[PDB]
Design a binder for these strands. Sequence first.
DNA 1: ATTCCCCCCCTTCGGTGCTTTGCACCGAAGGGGGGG
Lengths: 551, 388
Amino acid sequence: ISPIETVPVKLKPGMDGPKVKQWPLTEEKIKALVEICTEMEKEGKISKIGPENPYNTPVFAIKKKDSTKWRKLVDFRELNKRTQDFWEVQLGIPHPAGLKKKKSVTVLDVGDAYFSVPLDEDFRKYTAFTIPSINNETPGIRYQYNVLPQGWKGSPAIFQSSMTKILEPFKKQNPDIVIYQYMDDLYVGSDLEIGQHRTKIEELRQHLLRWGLTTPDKKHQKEPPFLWMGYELHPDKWTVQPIVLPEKDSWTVNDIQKLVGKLNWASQIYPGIKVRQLSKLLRGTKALTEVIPLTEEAELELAENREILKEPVHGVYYDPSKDLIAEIQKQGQGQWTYQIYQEPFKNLKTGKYARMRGAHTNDVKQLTEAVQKITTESIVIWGKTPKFKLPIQKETWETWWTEYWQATWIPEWEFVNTPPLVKLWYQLEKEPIVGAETFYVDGAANRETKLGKAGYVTNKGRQKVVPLTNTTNQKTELQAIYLALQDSGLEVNIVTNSQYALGIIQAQPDKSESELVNQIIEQLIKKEKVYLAWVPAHKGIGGNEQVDKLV
Amino acid sequence: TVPVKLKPGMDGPKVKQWPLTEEKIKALVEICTEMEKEGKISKIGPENPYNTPVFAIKKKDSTKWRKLVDFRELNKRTQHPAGLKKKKSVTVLDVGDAYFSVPLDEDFRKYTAFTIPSINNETPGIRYQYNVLPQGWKGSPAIFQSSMTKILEPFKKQNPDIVIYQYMDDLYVGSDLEIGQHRTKIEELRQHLLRWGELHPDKWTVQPIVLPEKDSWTVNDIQKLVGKLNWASQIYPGIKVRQLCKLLRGTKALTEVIPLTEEAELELAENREILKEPVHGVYYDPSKDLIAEIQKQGQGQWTYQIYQEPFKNLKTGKYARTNDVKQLTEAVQKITTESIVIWGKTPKFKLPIQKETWETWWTEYWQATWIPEWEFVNTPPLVKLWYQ
DNA sequence: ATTCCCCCCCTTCGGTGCTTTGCACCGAAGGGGGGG
């Protein structure tokens, strides 16, 4: 056993140990369970208890993906509910792109990890369980855990802390050795030759064995490629382990959900992965077995993804002496791809951004969100912010961030001329246009019956009113603005009493969930010059007497 | 002192760490290693369920890193000289490296836990807890309050005119002296503190509201003016818009020139006199909290209002000065320092920024030892420049 | 038929705030992917 000090663990205040009774099990499962319990008892993992233990916990078996083998599991859900809270020290997942090129590299796994760290003496009684007392009659034998149980929510944090405590003196005495520790998986890198590295690896292995932790040779990797954390590590490059997409002929909701998940995983190194048209098939259908026919757009995206996922694609490692550069491309419909590299055509890692934040937004807003996401992700992996290459022009960004009411920023970046370019499709005039008609618009909807009218009056002798059904004040105001745009020339001044419509339009969107707003946008692009003015709602202005007592 | 129990019926902080740059991480590791040797902090395990964010700053551009802990959530669960405002010069000195000699209560140390992250998640984060009085926690000046008087008694009685105020880790020394004599007394105070171990509030001016002045007014210009007065009626009542509304009747071109009637110039002028007045009836409630709204006026111009109740402004200002986030961060630190000197409480900001934008970059340009509470506004508050 | 911890994306639903009792935004939970 590990001679490491135990971590004092208690239950939540005012709580008690579980008293659940074990559900019946088949005669096939019980034999494997009693054999496993006997082996663990003889090894010291568990101890037999007498009738003084009131607590209990159900125990079952799983196939362990081996058919013949039957792994024993314990349903610690009650204990986990009644167990004090822990703070997880695993703040993220290591990425191979952040690894530096190393002359010598090893991957080790600690066998029987949880069963090596002792459990706190006072907490062992709560972990008591009983084996399905045979077919029945004679009671089952009851055991209690002496080591970290599997299925208990406190096991990972305790084991991680114990591993860190074990490893810290070795790292202190070997400052030139990089050790990536993730649960029981160790990645050891050094610049020494193969002989010195192998000598130091055995020194580390004997150090772990001094504390009871064992490293079996079946999980010890000595030659490349290294299967590490789902990636294949080579001396100068890395790749994800092979990805197999489904080839169903009649897709379901679950099949599409699994398909989208694998494409997100593949997007970290495969460039140009799109999942927008495929994830749209998951809207409106909630049954996990319902068969969804593939649409025409979804079929196109699937074929493109299959074509992209055919050629071999690999990444490279990180050199601290060079500057990180991230380049962004736009794919349409709110989708962006990006590649982070250090030298051209050698990607450190790729990725995509397709989040739809807000009901109304433009390309410039989404570009800033993508830049912020890339910066946050890069700080985690490498610790520094990369230099950006965006398809937006400097003057466009200057105009946007100078005319915008919010504070927005982008770090050091330069313009790259790769279409499609990011631009604002229309601009609102800051002053009224001389000679253009003025449209005083107003839309009023009755809340009770959800009926209303939207209309406009103009400087000349024109005036229009249109009735709307199943509408509200906001929709009527938007429809009044739309009517004003519809029947005017190329230059128009529009005076409205609605702050909601002005707030929507003034942000310069080009896409919107609402269908009415999209028509307004497509009408605004046609116009040459447009001025939008706000007027007080009910203060006798010209758009208050002849526009309100009307629509 | 000792019992520093929390407010009844609530638990400690459980905030996440958020990523840090490797330049700042190297600073925290060196700083926390030195503090561990001195016994100020000690390593803990995962059995402690509490956590508060931590990061490092470069205050005063001294090229020496300083550790900062975000105790905003611990301060909310722990439970002022009016003549300082009228003073001429307020010097702000740091007394943070003085609570390290006062041990913290043993039962309270578990709530001060923090985690130092690692680059690329190489190792699980290293966790520590405070053994002495931490910096940034509201209880640090309160427990050391009884010890500051013993050091400020030989000084305050020597120079009664000196007004000294302590907030968090900062000492506010206010005097009516000159530019040079104030500095000499500051050095005497600094050396006096060593034995035991630049603001100008008089120059602060309120920002009033000004109506535009024109010789000829168009329909669009009057419509914009009418909107201002109607909005300003809630702040400064006694503003009536009837003789100005009578010039906006009937469908007219937005650029049509409207001749101002002789009877309407009175209301335009009369409302200007009403507008050029400090609206009284604003009394700072010591129980309620301060709210500071900030609006981006463009061209490197920011306006702010400090209020406890809507439309009842306690203070109006304007901060002038490529980097929008840095400008906003500088404004927050300047408004907060104003409120501490004037009222003694940090305001609750309503920043005109995206939440993701702020959290990514605000630590880069921060230089204060205290952190106020802020909320992010999303509705577009740009309909007319009411506070221009 | 039954476990545990961590990171991510995409969709759905309830809560919150301002105002225009509708609408926009946000966070948590469901599904999926990956690691141990």
